[PDB]
Amino acid sequence: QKTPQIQVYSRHPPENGKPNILNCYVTQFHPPHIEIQMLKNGKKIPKVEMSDMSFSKDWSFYILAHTEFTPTETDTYACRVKHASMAEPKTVYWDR
Amino acid sequence: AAVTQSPRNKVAVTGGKVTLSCNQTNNHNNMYWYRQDTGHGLRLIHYSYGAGSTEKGDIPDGYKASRPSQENFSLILELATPSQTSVYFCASGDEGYTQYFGPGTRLLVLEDLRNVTPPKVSLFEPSKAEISHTQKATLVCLATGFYPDHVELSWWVNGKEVHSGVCTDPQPLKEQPALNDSRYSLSSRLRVSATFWQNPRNHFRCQVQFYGLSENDEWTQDRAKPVTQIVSAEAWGRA
Amino acid sequence: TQVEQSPQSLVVRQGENCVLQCNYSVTPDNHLRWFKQDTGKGLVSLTVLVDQKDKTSNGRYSATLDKDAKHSTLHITATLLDDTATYICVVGDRGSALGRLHFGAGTQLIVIPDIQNPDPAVYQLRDSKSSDKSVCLFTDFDSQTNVSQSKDSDVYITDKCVLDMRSMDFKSNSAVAWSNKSDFACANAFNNSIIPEDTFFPS
Amino acid sequence: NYTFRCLQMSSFANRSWSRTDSVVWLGDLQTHRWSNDSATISFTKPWSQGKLSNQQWEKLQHMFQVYRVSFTRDIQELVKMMSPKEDYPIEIQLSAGCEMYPGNASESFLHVAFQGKYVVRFWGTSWQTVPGAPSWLDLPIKVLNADQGTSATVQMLLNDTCPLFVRGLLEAGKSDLEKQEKPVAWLSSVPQLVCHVSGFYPKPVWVMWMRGDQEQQGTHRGDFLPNADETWYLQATLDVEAGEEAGLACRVKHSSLGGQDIILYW
Ligand SMILES: CCCCCCCCCCCCCCCCCCCCCCCCCC(=O)N[C@@H](CO[C@H]1O[C@H](CNC(=O)Nc2cccc3ccccc23)[C@H](O)[C@H](O)[C@H]1O)[C@H](O)[C@H](O)CCCCCCCCCCCCCC
Ligand SMILES: *[C@@H]1O[C@H](CO[C@@H]2O[C@@H](C)[C@@H](O)[C@@H](O)[C@@H]2O)[C@@H](O[C@@H]2O[C@H](CO)[C@@H](O)[C@H](O)[C@H]2NC(C)=O)[C@H](O)[C@H]1NC(C)=O
Ligand SMILES: *[C@@H]1O[C@H](CO)[C@@H](O)[C@H](O)[C@H]1NC(C)=O
Ligand SMILES: *[C@@H]1O[C@H](CO)[C@@H](O)[C@H](O)[C@H]1NC(C)=O
């Protein structure tokens, strides 16, 4: 049983007020059952596209979630993950 | 690859415990129990992948399975019902696809044992007129007054079973058709060369194996307890 | 029900060929086996077919399998009396013990014996232990003759049945009648059946 | 050289519940998807059928459709057979496909993981356990190897069908396989400097921090991270004392640029 690594990053260079795409890449986990949310100011974003689950050469699973977003000075963005390897959901915030 | 089953034939009462055993000496890991009813293909009840393992098949309800050893696989009917009247087949196999079938066990579950009755058996001796007309001699065996219809009629000459020249009615007939409780009759023929019948050193015997009660079934009637038994009739050839 | 056999039953005359069919929807279909089961008996394996397009034989038995059509036939050349039985088609869905067997419900074959030299007679047989008890045996009639059930509830008549004396290559039909009365006779016994014009009644 | 990989993931939560999901990759491009929910395999590229005719494809998909049901019941039976040694929840993964080499050459593989550990492969004409595998697997191997029809099918898949198919895929997808997509870079810092590079395809990339003519020892390349449009993302970090930012540049080299490097001064 192994813990998911989470990486949050933007597709294009972040410019306040401009439409972009936010990625949440979750890796290195097993078993493959997992719940991934993307959040804007702590609230669930509804239109979140998910890649197919897949796995690497070391047999561990990975999946890519991404959503449209517009960065602003004040809005926070995060990716929240629930997986059986963890007692509490892990939230990784978009930084820059 | 040899598979055996016991009992081969069983009359039982509703609500009794019935155990059907299967033994194989092939060192096969795998064993399977099926039932075959008219109009249907064999249908899988329980199976087993080795000692201590039993698995549900397609129609497991009302049956329990036991696999105490590599050799033995039992089918246990804890509370027999009339719907379990059937022919049961056991099979074994290894990792390959072939299943090796046992010879079958006939089970009849009656709602009540009160009319069970063993047969009377009579042997009838060749007509002298047949002997002179054809040079053959036909013996007839009659089994009568038995219930239910679970009998095996066989012929023995000098203590060895004969099949050639034998014909047994496929169906036993009803003595009193108007009746649900009706007893049955059954005839069989053994035809030999006249000179065979004429030899006084040949001992002919008609045997009927009757299936009935076991030593452990309860019996409340005055008449003798109608247990599983052989009834037989006999004659020697004569010149 | 994924395995269908046809016909349900057929009656043929000794010496005639016949063909039995099996059609299935079992998927995947690793192999197909034919069994013979005599009345009261177990299953005897006749052949197993394993290839996409396959043919096998075993004496007077041959079989074809076409997996694309999910169709098999069993051919019996020159039927004998001992071919009377139920023929069962079975499809295995794996080439290992992980497989399940899918059983057809069977086809019932009946073979009518060729009786070449009929000599129809009605004989009286006496009981080995009682002088007074007897049966009447109607025997050696050809297979066109039918035995009818008695016109009296006190009289009992069995159906015809064929015996084969293998050592002699000799087959004969017989049927037996008796009655728990004493004023009952052999000449009267089979009155109710259409028995041949020239039946031998010895006195 | 390209590796074609069919990846199957199967979960079995208990005696009744299971799902099987697959994806197919050619190098780092997804060509197929087959969700548990779907009766049919989906193409994720216009060229995913490769050079197969409609008839050949419909036939092949049909065989996989049956295989998915067969696989599922075979695992469930294999568990009953090993009982109580192994129990649910169980995870099986398969990785199958071939690596294509220059000319007429290839190698195929079929690797099986149980609970996330590689234990079994098809090799030559039969299944075998690999070193480190637990001995109980010998009974399932023995049972699987009794299945001659499966063995002949798998040898044909690995030796003939797979390389034939992939060769067709390579011709049909040439255009997408050889696409060039230009990176775009940008800079930031945290209380260390970060050069963000995103949008590039294919994967080979060179990112270095420079002061003028001189490459910095300390540069730390992150992992390659995917974008949703099948391009790549990468960051390179450099720790510096505060005040020394001035005069550092990020430099990116990528095939797509035609040798006009991205150069970004702080
Ligand atoms: C291989 C990669 C190259 C492919 C190139 C094409 C690319 C298209 C892209 C789309 C693919 C997306 C899906 C990706 C998923 C990855 C799949 C890789 C798995 C390949 C294994 C396929 C095995 C095929 C044979 C099969 O289905 N055999 C099954 C049916 O078998 C019956 O029926 C057969 C007829 N049936 C039969 O022969 N069927 C097939 C016939 C012809 C072609 C077939 C092609 C595919 C599937 C079945 C075919 C024969 O008659 C057999 O005799 C009969 O028994 C058996 O049931 C078999 O046991 C299934 C399981 C195989 C995998 C075992 C893995 C090891 C597990 C260890 C367990 C650990 C223990 C746990 C406690
Ligand atoms: C298919 O190829 C194998 C050998 O190829 C290896 O295994 C494949 C499944 C695939 O993974 C390849 O890239 C591998 O290199 C043949 O197996 C040989 O068969 C011969 C005789 O049958 C036997 O004596 C050898 O030991 C086998 N080789 C090995 C390495 O085990 C196989 O016969 C081929 N089958 C068909 C139908 O083409
Ligand atoms: C088996 O597993 C599934 C998924 O966890 C669960 O929802 C289902 O209720 C289970 N059923 C049984 C009979 O155990
Ligand atoms: C996956 O697909 C199979 C076959 O259609 C189905 O019966 C099964 O319930 C599915 N599993 C889940 C978890 O949806």
PDB file of C-alpha atoms in Angstrom, chain B residues 30 32 34 36 39-42 44 47 49 56-58 89 94-99 101-103 106 122-127 129-130 133-134 136 138-140 142 144 163-170 173-176 185 187 189 191-193 234-235, chain C residues 30-31 33 35 37 40-43 48 50 88 94-101 103-105 119 121 123-129 133-135 137 139-140 149 153 156-168 170 172 174-176 178 200 202:
ATOM      1  CA  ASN B  30     -11.171 -31.823  -8.502  1.00  0.00           C
ATOM      2  CA  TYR B  32     -18.109 -32.390  -9.044  1.00  0.00           C
ATOM      3  CA  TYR B  34     -24.461 -33.183 -10.828  1.00  0.00           C
ATOM      4  CA  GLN B  36     -29.853 -35.271 -14.191  1.00  0.00           C
ATOM      5  CA  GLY B  39     -35.963 -32.914 -20.093  1.00  0.00           C
ATOM      6  CA  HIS B  40     -32.735 -31.367 -18.762  1.00  0.00           C
ATOM      7  CA  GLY B  41     -29.007 -31.561 -19.284  1.00  0.00           C
ATOM      8  CA  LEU B  42     -26.881 -32.522 -16.246  1.00  0.00           C
ATOM      9  CA  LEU B  44     -23.940 -28.721 -11.499  1.00  0.00           C
ATOM     10  CA  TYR B  47     -17.847 -28.942  -6.778  1.00  0.00           C
ATOM     11  CA  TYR B  49     -10.906 -28.085  -5.848  1.00  0.00           C
ATOM     12  CA  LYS B  56     -21.429 -23.769  -4.896  1.00  0.00           C
ATOM     13  CA  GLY B  57     -22.385 -24.836  -8.446  1.00  0.00           C
ATOM     14  CA  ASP B  58     -25.440 -23.694 -10.441  1.00  0.00           C
ATOM     15  CA  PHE B  89     -23.566 -38.165 -10.978  1.00  0.00           C
ATOM     16  CA  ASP B  94      -7.110 -33.061 -12.687  1.00  0.00           C
ATOM     17  CA  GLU B  95      -5.976 -29.740 -14.168  1.00  0.00           C
ATOM     18  CA  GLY B  96      -6.973 -30.791 -17.789  1.00  0.00           C
ATOM     19  CA  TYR B  97     -10.509 -30.463 -19.229  1.00  0.00           C
ATOM     20  CA  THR B  98     -11.782 -34.070 -18.937  1.00  0.00           C
ATOM     21  CA  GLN B  99     -14.231 -35.057 -16.189  1.00  0.00           C
ATOM     22  CA  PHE B 101     -18.074 -39.698 -14.452  1.00  0.00           C
ATOM     23  CA  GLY B 102     -19.296 -42.085 -11.775  1.00  0.00           C
ATOM     24  CA  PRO B 103     -22.104 -44.510 -12.726  1.00  0.00           C
ATOM     25  CA  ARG B 106     -30.919 -43.127  -8.286  1.00  0.00           C
ATOM     26  CA  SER B 122     -41.276 -66.716  -9.195  1.00  0.00           C
ATOM     27  CA  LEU B 123     -39.277 -68.521 -11.850  1.00  0.00           C
ATOM     28  CA  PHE B 124     -41.161 -70.282 -14.674  1.00  0.00           C
ATOM     29  CA  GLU B 125     -39.617 -73.195 -16.541  1.00  0.00           C
ATOM     30  CA  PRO B 126     -39.398 -73.729 -20.350  1.00  0.00           C
ATOM     31  CA  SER B 127     -42.305 -75.222 -22.248  1.00  0.00           C
ATOM     32  CA  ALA B 129     -43.390 -77.585 -26.675  1.00  0.00           C
ATOM     33  CA  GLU B 130     -40.985 -74.646 -27.173  1.00  0.00           C
ATOM     34  CA  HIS B 133     -40.374 -76.616 -31.898  1.00  0.00           C
ATOM     35  CA  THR B 134     -37.333 -74.288 -31.777  1.00  0.00           C
ATOM     36  CA  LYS B 136     -34.481 -73.233 -27.425  1.00  0.00           C
ATOM     37  CA  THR B 138     -37.120 -69.724 -22.355  1.00  0.00           C
ATOM     38  CA  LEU B 139     -37.190 -69.087 -18.641  1.00  0.00           C
ATOM     39  CA  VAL B 140     -39.490 -66.361 -17.290  1.00  0.00           C
ATOM     40  CA  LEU B 142     -41.936 -62.597 -12.408  1.00  0.00           C
ATOM     41  CA  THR B 144     -44.794 -58.947  -8.092  1.00  0.00           C
ATOM     42  CA  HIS B 163     -26.568 -60.751 -20.041  1.00  0.00           C
ATOM     43  CA  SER B 164     -26.823 -62.571 -23.335  1.00  0.00           C
ATOM     44  CA  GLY B 165     -30.293 -63.858 -24.247  1.00  0.00           C
ATOM     45  CA  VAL B 166     -31.860 -61.698 -21.512  1.00  0.00           C
ATOM     46  CA  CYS B 167     -34.650 -59.173 -21.841  1.00  0.00           C
ATOM     47  CA  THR B 168     -36.238 -57.335 -18.912  1.00  0.00           C
ATOM     48  CA  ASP B 169     -39.343 -55.068 -19.292  1.00  0.00           C
ATOM     49  CA  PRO B 170     -38.103 -51.452 -19.477  1.00  0.00           C
ATOM     50  CA  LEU B 173     -46.364 -52.433 -14.769  1.00  0.00           C
ATOM     51  CA  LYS B 174     -49.082 -51.288 -12.329  1.00  0.00           C
ATOM     52  CA  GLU B 175     -51.129 -54.048 -10.684  1.00  0.00           C
ATOM     53  CA  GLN B 176     -54.020 -51.707  -9.898  1.00  0.00           C
ATOM     54  CA  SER B 185     -45.009 -56.154 -11.456  1.00  0.00           C
ATOM     55  CA  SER B 187     -41.116 -59.698 -15.968  1.00  0.00           C
ATOM     56  CA  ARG B 189     -36.808 -63.493 -19.956  1.00  0.00           C
ATOM     57  CA  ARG B 191     -33.481 -67.778 -23.378  1.00  0.00           C
ATOM     58  CA  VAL B 192     -30.834 -70.487 -23.792  1.00  0.00           C
ATOM     59  CA  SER B 193     -30.247 -73.450 -26.149  1.00  0.00           C
ATOM     60  CA  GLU B 234     -34.093 -70.685  -8.699  1.00  0.00           C
ATOM     61  CA  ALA B 235     -34.185 -73.969 -10.730  1.00  0.00           C
TER      62      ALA B 235
ATOM     63  CA  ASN C  30     -13.023 -25.099 -26.367  1.00  0.00           C
ATOM     64  CA  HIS C  31     -14.250 -28.645 -27.125  1.00  0.00           C
ATOM     65  CA  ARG C  33     -17.999 -34.102 -26.538  1.00  0.00           C
ATOM     66  CA  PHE C  35     -21.818 -39.199 -24.821  1.00  0.00           C
ATOM     67  CA  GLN C  37     -26.199 -43.182 -22.123  1.00  0.00           C
ATOM     68  CA  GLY C  40     -30.591 -46.849 -16.489  1.00  0.00           C
ATOM     69  CA  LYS C  41     -26.882 -46.372 -17.050  1.00  0.00           C
ATOM     70  CA  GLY C  42     -23.997 -43.924 -17.018  1.00  0.00           C
ATOM     71  CA  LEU C  43     -22.300 -41.814 -19.594  1.00  0.00           C
ATOM     72  CA  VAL C  48     -14.342 -35.295 -28.450  1.00  0.00           C
ATOM     73  CA  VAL C  50     -11.397 -29.763 -30.354  1.00  0.00           C
ATOM     74  CA  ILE C  88     -25.872 -36.180 -25.188  1.00  0.00           C
ATOM     75  CA  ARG C  94     -12.109 -23.927 -21.359  1.00  0.00           C
ATOM     76  CA  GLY C  95      -9.161 -26.193 -22.254  1.00  0.00           C
ATOM     77  CA  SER C  96      -8.545 -26.712 -18.483  1.00  0.00           C
ATOM     78  CA  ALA C  97     -10.257 -27.424 -15.156  1.00  0.00           C
ATOM     79  CA  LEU C  98     -11.253 -23.718 -14.925  1.00  0.00           C
ATOM     80  CA  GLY C  99     -13.968 -24.698 -17.443  1.00  0.00           C
ATOM     81  CA  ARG C 100     -17.605 -25.541 -16.982  1.00  0.00           C
ATOM     82  CA  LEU C 101     -19.443 -28.241 -18.953  1.00  0.00           C
ATOM     83  CA  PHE C 103     -24.936 -30.300 -21.259  1.00  0.00           C
ATOM     84  CA  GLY C 104     -27.529 -30.743 -24.001  1.00  0.00           C
ATOM     85  CA  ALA C 105     -30.773 -32.435 -22.901  1.00  0.00           C
ATOM     86  CA  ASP C 119     -41.925 -68.293 -35.908  1.00  0.00           C
ATOM     87  CA  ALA C 121     -46.059 -69.009 -30.903  1.00  0.00           C
ATOM     88  CA  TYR C 123     -46.353 -71.247 -24.910  1.00  0.00           C
ATOM     89  CA  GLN C 124     -47.342 -72.174 -21.377  1.00  0.00           C
ATOM     90  CA  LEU C 125     -44.626 -72.121 -18.693  1.00  0.00           C
ATOM     91  CA  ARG C 126     -45.049 -73.686 -15.276  1.00  0.00           C
ATOM     92  CA  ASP C 127     -43.741 -72.410 -11.944  1.00  0.00           C
ATOM     93  CA  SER C 128     -40.566 -74.056 -10.630  1.00  0.00           C
ATOM     94  CA  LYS C 129     -42.143 -74.584  -7.175  1.00  0.00           C
ATOM     95  CA  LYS C 133     -49.134 -71.525 -11.318  1.00  0.00           C
ATOM     96  CA  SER C 134     -48.331 -70.565 -14.927  1.00  0.00           C
ATOM     97  CA  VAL C 135     -47.543 -67.760 -17.365  1.00  0.00           C
ATOM     98  CA  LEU C 137     -45.284 -66.492 -23.352  1.00  0.00           C
ATOM     99  CA  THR C 139     -42.775 -65.218 -28.736  1.00  0.00           C
ATOM    100  CA  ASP C 140     -40.830 -65.032 -32.016  1.00  0.00           C
ATOM    101  CA  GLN C 149     -52.770 -54.396 -22.996  1.00  0.00           C
ATOM    102  CA  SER C 153     -57.956 -55.837 -14.810  1.00  0.00           C
ATOM    103  CA  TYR C 156     -51.648 -58.796 -16.887  1.00  0.00           C
ATOM    104  CA  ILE C 157     -49.771 -58.397 -20.165  1.00  0.00           C
ATOM    105  CA  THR C 158     -46.300 -56.918 -20.519  1.00  0.00           C
ATOM    106  CA  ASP C 159     -45.064 -55.016 -23.567  1.00  0.00           C
ATOM    107  CA  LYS C 160     -42.908 -56.739 -26.184  1.00  0.00           C
ATOM    108  CA  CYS C 161     -39.198 -56.801 -25.506  1.00  0.00           C
ATOM    109  CA  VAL C 162     -36.259 -58.113 -27.566  1.00  0.00           C
ATOM    110  CA  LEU C 163     -33.549 -60.502 -26.461  1.00  0.00           C
ATOM    111  CA  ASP C 164     -30.248 -61.095 -28.236  1.00  0.00           C
ATOM    112  CA  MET C 165     -28.572 -64.513 -27.956  1.00  0.00           C
ATOM    113  CA  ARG C 166     -25.149 -63.222 -29.035  1.00  0.00           C
ATOM    114  CA  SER C 167     -23.431 -66.626 -29.342  1.00  0.00           C
ATOM    115  CA  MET C 168     -26.117 -67.706 -31.839  1.00  0.00           C
ATOM    116  CA  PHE C 170     -30.259 -64.624 -32.868  1.00  0.00           C
ATOM    117  CA  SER C 172     -36.466 -62.651 -30.679  1.00  0.00           C
ATOM    118  CA  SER C 174     -41.504 -61.827 -26.540  1.00  0.00           C
ATOM    119  CA  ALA C 175     -44.317 -60.654 -24.282  1.00  0.00           C
ATOM    120  CA  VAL C 176     -45.700 -62.357 -21.192  1.00  0.00           C
ATOM    121  CA  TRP C 178     -50.622 -64.094 -16.583  1.00  0.00           C
ATOM    122  CA  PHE C 200     -48.489 -71.769 -33.189  1.00  0.00           C
ATOM    123  CA  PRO C 202     -49.561 -76.301 -29.002  1.00  0.00           C
TER     124      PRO C 202
END
